[PDB]
Amino acid sequence: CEMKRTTLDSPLGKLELSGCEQGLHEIKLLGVPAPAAVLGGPEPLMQCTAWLNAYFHQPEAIEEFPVPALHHPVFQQESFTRQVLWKLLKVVKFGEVISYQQLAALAGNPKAARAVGGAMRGNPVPILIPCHRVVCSSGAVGNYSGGLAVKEWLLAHEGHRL
Numbered sequence: 001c002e003m004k005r006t007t008l009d010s011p012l013g014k015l016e017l018s019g020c021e022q023g024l025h026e027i028k029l030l031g032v033p034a035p036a037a038v039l040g041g042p043e044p045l046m047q048c049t050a051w052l053n054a055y056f057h058q059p060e061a062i063e064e065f066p067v068p069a070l071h072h073p074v075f076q077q078e079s080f081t082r083q084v085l086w087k088l089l090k091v092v093k094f095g096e097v098i099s100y101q102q103l104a105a106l107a108g109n110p111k112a113a114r115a116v117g118g119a120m121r122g123n124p125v126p127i128l129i130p131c132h133r134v135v136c137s138s139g140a141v142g143n144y145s146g147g148l149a150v151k152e153w154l155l156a157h158e159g160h161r162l
């Protein structure tokens with residue numbers, strides 16, 4: 001699993017994308033459309049770069065971009081966390097939101113909202129797997145592993161009045 005990396009500047013700051021031939025491993029926030037610092041394969045990395053560029057700069061076409069394969073260890077083995085992440089990825093689209101409770105139910109256990117909240121913090125590929133779209137049943141934005149301001153920027157970017 002030879003790890004390759006590249007960096008992509010964005011409205012959220014420099015994003016570090018890492019992965020291998022088998023898939024995208026992580027999207028990390030290090031703190032005008034920009035190119036990835038290092039061009040070329042592996043394929044999942046190039047796909048992630050194109051996806052992110054579209055998400056930030058050509059959002060109307062986001063559904064057109066293929067989602068790269070994921071190979072971070074969290075996706076390699078079965079677990080409630082993986083079930084949660086995959087469900088979120090598959091169901092909650094651009095402009096949509098879901099409560100921690102609804103996602104828990106989706107994952108098969110309506111009473112596991114806290115575990116769902118914990119699962120969000122174990123998400124290695126934010127934005128792509130929209131942990132920012134998981135919010136409070138009260139209407140509040142809710143906590144975010146990457147900070148409230150970041151969660152609010154993403155939600156505002158998707159049409160929310162924030």
Ligand SMILES: [Zn+2]
Pocket residue numbers: 001019020021022023025071072
């Ligand atoms: Zn890998």
